[PDB]
Amino acid sequence: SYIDPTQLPYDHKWEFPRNRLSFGKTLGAGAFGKVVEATAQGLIKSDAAMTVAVKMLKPSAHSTEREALMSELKVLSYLGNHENIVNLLGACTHGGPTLVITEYCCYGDLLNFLRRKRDEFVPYLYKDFLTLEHLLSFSYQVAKGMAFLASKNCIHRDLAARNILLTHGNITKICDFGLARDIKNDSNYVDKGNARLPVKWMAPESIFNSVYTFESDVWSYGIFLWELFSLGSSPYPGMPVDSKFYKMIKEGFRMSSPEYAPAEMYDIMKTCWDADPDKRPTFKQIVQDIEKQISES
Ligand SMILES: *C(C)CC1=Nc2ccc(NC(=O)Cc3ncc(Oc4ccnc5cc(OC)ccc45)cc3OC)cc2C(C)(C)O1
């Protein structure tokens, strides 16, 4: 980590009264936390109600998870607004357990969206079919959001389609479900030491040395691109995470192109998976490379 979230300040301008929230359905839940849909009255100054997403801890949570939710709130507050990041709207740190209030993204996580849209995908009307133009736009927006996070000295550590949200106008927003994900029952997380980690998305230096950098997030972005252009398929299909998997990645085995990736997008993935972190493109370089591909299209 480059930044210390605990030394980050918390602006009380974010403070929102919890009695002005009406909780609805659970959007996501893990062992210690959950994301819940809510209606916030008096969030908009004109007295119009609005839908928000609220992250909070369950009574099952410990001191570690309580500190983690406060650190998460300081980090979100520090970042500020960006179009490709889930935006903080408010919080409640007084009169009860910590509540983190963000904007609500109506289409939910990108992975589930892609899987639902898989069968009606068109490479090139009212029906709202998913096209190659959308996948290229999602690639671009995620690289833009990640370029912004890197400029703010943020290392995500869990960049994957499951941590990307989709909202109005095909706008993608990077988020981090964290504790509001059931990692114990998610097959995308594997037991590694006394941790349950997303190994198929992790750079070799993160797997073998527990090192997380700007460059290890680029590797995960390469994996994200593979999920995107395979329309939500799990990476390294038919390959379980075992000693052979670790050996193969260390030796240079890399996934072949997903079925719908343009050759120029597969070229980005190959560079994101370079064994040498210094040879990987930066998110800024990726943004410029995709912008160019979008124009030429
Ligand atoms: C720098 C260290 C990088 C960094 N860190 C970081 C940490 C923590 C977060 N938190 C969240 O994103 C919190 C959060 N995540 C997801 C979420 O779920 C939502 C939100 C909106 N709409 C949703 C709609 C759904 O279905 C319709 C389902 C879930 C939804 C909510 C939420 O907080 C309420 C983020 C970061 C980032 C990535 C900024 O960077």
XYZ file of C-alpha atoms and ligand atoms in Angstrom:
337
model
C 0.000 0.000 0.000
C 1.221 3.528 -0.852
C -1.257 5.471 1.299
C -2.195 4.988 5.017
C -6.013 5.232 5.212
C -5.913 5.788 8.993
C -3.892 9.094 8.573
C -6.540 10.258 6.044
C -8.991 12.924 7.301
C -12.760 12.575 7.475
C -14.819 15.623 6.422
C -17.993 15.965 8.517
C -19.617 17.548 5.361
C -20.391 13.883 4.449
C -22.476 13.328 7.647
C -26.046 12.220 6.805
C -28.828 11.389 9.383
C -29.668 7.636 9.280
C -33.323 8.350 10.268
C -33.651 9.870 6.725
C -32.803 6.434 5.154
C -35.452 3.751 4.337
C -33.693 0.398 3.765
C -34.839 -1.931 0.975
C -33.391 -5.151 -0.477
C -29.834 -6.517 0.089
C -27.710 -5.940 -2.999
C -24.785 -8.032 -1.745
C -23.657 -9.722 1.486
C -20.629 -11.434 2.961
C -19.760 -12.891 6.327
C -19.301 -9.474 8.026
C -20.849 -6.913 5.769
C -23.572 -6.065 3.324
C -24.675 -3.542 0.673
C -28.348 -2.535 0.949
C -30.519 -0.462 -1.431
C -32.063 2.561 0.348
C -34.193 5.647 -0.206
C -32.580 8.874 1.118
C -35.072 11.662 1.859
C -33.516 15.126 2.142
C -30.259 14.092 0.394
C -31.337 16.293 -2.550
C -31.954 19.848 -1.189
C -35.319 20.146 -3.127
C -36.806 17.371 -0.786
C -37.062 14.800 -3.637
C -36.199 11.218 -2.449
C -33.385 9.297 -4.080
C -32.115 5.740 -4.316
C -28.700 5.101 -2.791
C -26.541 2.056 -1.933
C -25.427 1.682 1.699
C -22.493 -0.385 2.856
C -22.558 -1.461 6.484
C -21.391 -4.206 8.801
C -23.454 -7.115 10.145
C -23.580 -7.867 13.981
C -21.185 -10.778 13.094
C -18.386 -8.131 12.448
C -15.293 -7.692 14.666
C -12.988 -4.725 15.586
C -10.841 -5.434 12.428
C -13.896 -5.095 10.172
C -14.978 -1.915 12.036
C -11.606 -0.252 11.406
C -11.734 -1.491 7.804
C -15.141 0.181 7.128
C -13.863 3.518 8.674
C -10.610 3.326 6.583
C -12.767 2.617 3.450
C -14.861 5.750 4.208
C -11.684 7.913 4.651
C -10.287 6.595 1.293
C -13.583 7.275 -0.602
C -13.795 10.774 0.944
C -10.122 11.494 -0.004
C -10.582 10.439 -3.650
C -13.365 12.857 -4.598
C -15.643 12.619 -7.589
C -14.760 10.808 -10.756
C -17.161 9.617 -13.453
C -15.657 6.037 -13.515
C -15.587 5.455 -9.768
C -18.634 4.748 -7.483
C -19.278 8.118 -5.872
C -19.640 8.701 -2.156
C -22.804 10.687 -1.290
C -22.716 10.610 2.512
C -21.956 8.640 5.665
C -23.053 8.087 9.257
C -20.338 7.787 11.889
C -22.444 8.969 14.903
C -25.494 7.385 16.605
C -24.815 3.818 15.490
C -22.772 1.526 13.237
C -20.892 3.092 10.301
C -22.912 3.555 7.064
C -21.190 4.354 3.747
C -23.662 5.892 1.240
C -22.899 5.893 -2.470
C -24.885 6.458 -5.683
C -26.998 3.511 -6.841
C -25.884 1.819 -10.133
C -29.074 0.420 -11.660
C -27.559 -2.412 -13.757
C -25.462 -3.816 -10.858
C -22.094 -5.554 -11.222
C -20.599 -5.944 -14.726
C -19.959 -9.714 -14.478
C -23.653 -10.536 -13.926
C -24.661 -8.029 -16.573
C -22.293 -9.695 -19.161
C -23.561 -13.197 -18.270
C -27.207 -12.031 -18.675
C -26.343 -10.288 -21.994
C -24.152 -13.170 -23.362
C -26.845 -14.938 -25.411
C -28.112 -11.733 -27.125
C -24.623 -10.286 -27.946
C -24.082 -8.872 -31.432
C -20.482 -8.049 -32.622
C -21.689 -5.362 -35.141
C -32.698 -1.041 -31.818
C -35.141 -1.021 -28.793
C -33.980 -4.550 -27.650
C -30.688 -3.031 -26.224
C -28.326 -5.700 -27.519
C -24.770 -5.757 -26.179
C -22.233 -4.943 -28.970
C -18.442 -4.768 -29.500
C -18.743 -0.929 -29.278
C -20.040 -1.348 -25.629
C -17.216 -3.746 -24.625
C -14.653 -1.300 -26.047
C -16.339 1.536 -24.125
C -16.270 -0.523 -20.848
C -12.517 -1.319 -21.458
C -11.821 2.434 -21.877
C -13.863 3.552 -18.863
C -12.312 1.002 -16.528
C -8.733 2.006 -17.741
C -9.736 5.716 -17.176
C -11.020 5.021 -13.641
C -7.927 2.934 -12.839
C -5.658 5.723 -14.287
C -7.431 8.133 -11.870
C -6.979 5.758 -8.879
C -3.260 5.266 -9.739
C -2.803 9.135 -9.882
C -4.287 9.175 -6.313
C -1.734 6.474 -5.207
C -4.473 3.838 -4.848
C -3.813 0.110 -5.402
C -7.207 -1.659 -5.805
C -5.919 -5.293 -5.179
C -9.200 -6.802 -6.443
C -9.860 -5.460 -9.983
C -12.318 -7.850 -11.699
C -15.700 -7.564 -13.501
C -17.432 -8.537 -10.154
C -16.015 -5.178 -8.774
C -17.219 -2.997 -11.675
C -20.750 -1.556 -11.649
C -22.847 -0.471 -14.584
C -25.163 2.529 -14.452
C -27.111 4.845 -16.876
C -25.724 5.547 -20.382
C -23.437 2.497 -20.274
C -21.256 4.139 -17.597
C -19.043 1.746 -15.648
C -17.912 2.548 -12.097
C -15.108 0.839 -10.236
C -16.059 -0.218 -6.723
C -14.902 -2.667 -4.053
C -17.581 -4.901 -2.460
C -14.925 -6.226 -0.051
C -16.706 -7.479 3.100
C -20.081 -7.296 1.296
C -18.953 -10.304 -0.865
C -19.279 -13.939 0.336
C -15.653 -14.851 -0.535
C -15.896 -18.157 1.472
C -18.486 -19.506 -1.039
C -17.261 -17.705 -4.184
C -15.205 -20.170 -6.371
C -13.238 -17.127 -7.796
C -11.405 -16.920 -4.379
C -8.983 -19.660 -3.356
C -7.458 -20.632 0.022
C -3.811 -19.383 -0.016
C -2.184 -19.521 3.396
C -4.684 -18.170 5.919
C -6.298 -15.944 3.276
C -9.050 -16.484 0.709
C -7.622 -14.659 -2.436
C -8.688 -14.073 -6.120
C -5.616 -15.954 -7.469
C -6.720 -16.074 -11.205
C -6.690 -12.208 -11.221
C -3.342 -11.821 -9.346
C 0.089 -11.008 -10.791
C 2.839 -13.573 -10.023
C 4.657 -11.043 -7.682
C 1.391 -10.737 -5.671
C 0.935 -14.533 -5.486
C 4.519 -15.463 -4.554
C 5.703 -12.273 -2.778
C 2.434 -10.649 -1.414
C 3.556 -7.440 -3.306
C 0.777 -5.158 -4.620
C 1.715 -2.219 -6.902
C 0.334 -0.099 -9.803
C 1.741 -2.849 -12.106
C -0.068 -5.735 -10.296
C -3.397 -3.880 -10.836
C -2.491 -3.728 -14.590
C -2.123 -7.543 -14.594
C -5.700 -7.844 -13.036
C -6.945 -5.372 -15.691
C -5.581 -7.781 -18.343
C -7.619 -10.595 -16.663
C -10.701 -8.235 -16.492
C -10.318 -7.668 -20.342
C -10.319 -11.429 -20.846
C -13.601 -11.742 -18.774
C -15.101 -8.787 -20.704
C -14.327 -10.115 -24.210
C -15.352 -13.740 -23.178
C -18.714 -12.152 -22.044
C -18.332 -13.068 -18.382
C -16.522 -16.418 -18.533
C -14.275 -17.403 -15.593
C -10.509 -17.071 -16.443
C -8.204 -20.121 -17.138
C -11.319 -22.263 -17.878
C -11.027 -25.904 -16.841
C -7.807 -25.176 -14.878
C -8.127 -25.552 -11.080
C -5.966 -23.418 -8.747
C -3.338 -25.939 -7.626
C 0.499 -26.375 -7.689
C 0.401 -26.942 -11.525
C -1.452 -23.603 -11.987
C 1.255 -21.711 -9.952
C 4.048 -23.548 -11.843
C 2.467 -22.743 -15.300
C 1.973 -18.975 -14.611
C 5.572 -18.696 -13.175
C 6.753 -20.481 -16.411
C 4.934 -18.070 -18.748
C 1.652 -19.861 -19.592
C -0.960 -17.248 -20.644
C -4.536 -17.484 -21.776
C -5.257 -17.427 -25.517
C -7.556 -14.636 -26.775
C -11.264 -14.660 -25.656
C -13.681 -15.341 -28.586
C -14.735 -11.686 -29.062
C -11.554 -9.747 -28.344
C -10.185 -7.640 -31.229
C -6.460 -8.451 -31.904
C -5.496 -4.949 -30.597
C -7.258 -5.669 -27.225
C -5.515 -9.067 -26.965
C -2.222 -7.155 -27.571
C -3.042 -5.043 -24.451
C -3.792 -8.238 -22.402
C -0.425 -9.841 -23.404
C 1.501 -6.699 -22.290
C -0.569 -6.557 -18.982
C 0.598 -10.184 -18.374
C 4.275 -9.558 -18.859
C 6.299 -11.441 -16.195
C 8.418 -8.267 -15.741
C 6.164 -5.602 -14.047
C 8.317 -2.804 -15.621
C 7.333 -4.043 -19.130
C 3.566 -3.747 -18.425
C 1.766 -0.655 -19.850
C 0.517 1.964 -17.343
C -3.289 2.595 -17.142
C -2.594 5.950 -18.816
C -0.886 4.194 -21.781
C -3.815 1.674 -21.974
C -6.338 4.624 -22.040
C -4.452 6.251 -24.974
C -4.209 2.889 -26.813
C -8.006 2.182 -26.464
C -9.011 5.831 -27.325
C -7.032 5.325 -30.595
C -8.844 1.955 -31.296
C -12.292 3.537 -30.611
C -11.624 6.410 -33.107
C -10.280 4.048 -35.867
C -13.444 1.834 -35.410
C -7.668 2.927 -3.430
C -7.160 2.240 -2.196
C -8.601 2.355 -4.213
C -9.999 2.156 -3.932
N -10.361 1.671 -2.769
C -11.721 1.489 -2.518
C -12.095 0.972 -1.273
C -13.432 0.771 -0.972
C -14.417 1.082 -1.905
N -15.764 0.859 -1.538
C -16.850 0.660 -2.309
O -16.847 0.670 -3.538
C -18.113 0.417 -1.507
C -19.285 -0.149 -2.262
N -19.019 -1.090 -3.186
C -20.042 -1.610 -3.875
C -21.344 -1.218 -3.668
O -22.388 -1.781 -4.385
C -23.227 -0.973 -5.139
C -23.143 0.396 -5.268
C -24.075 1.031 -6.079
N -25.050 0.421 -6.735
C -25.142 -0.944 -6.617
C -26.178 -1.605 -7.317
C -26.294 -2.974 -7.219
O -27.266 -3.682 -7.872
C -28.310 -2.940 -8.535
C -25.413 -3.727 -6.439
C -24.406 -3.111 -5.748
C -24.241 -1.697 -5.821
C -21.615 -0.263 -2.708
C -20.581 0.296 -1.981
O -20.768 1.249 -1.021
C -22.118 1.601 -0.703
C -14.055 1.595 -3.145
C -12.714 1.804 -3.458
C -12.315 2.342 -4.780
C -12.600 1.347 -5.892
C -12.961 3.679 -5.087
O -10.860 2.510 -4.953
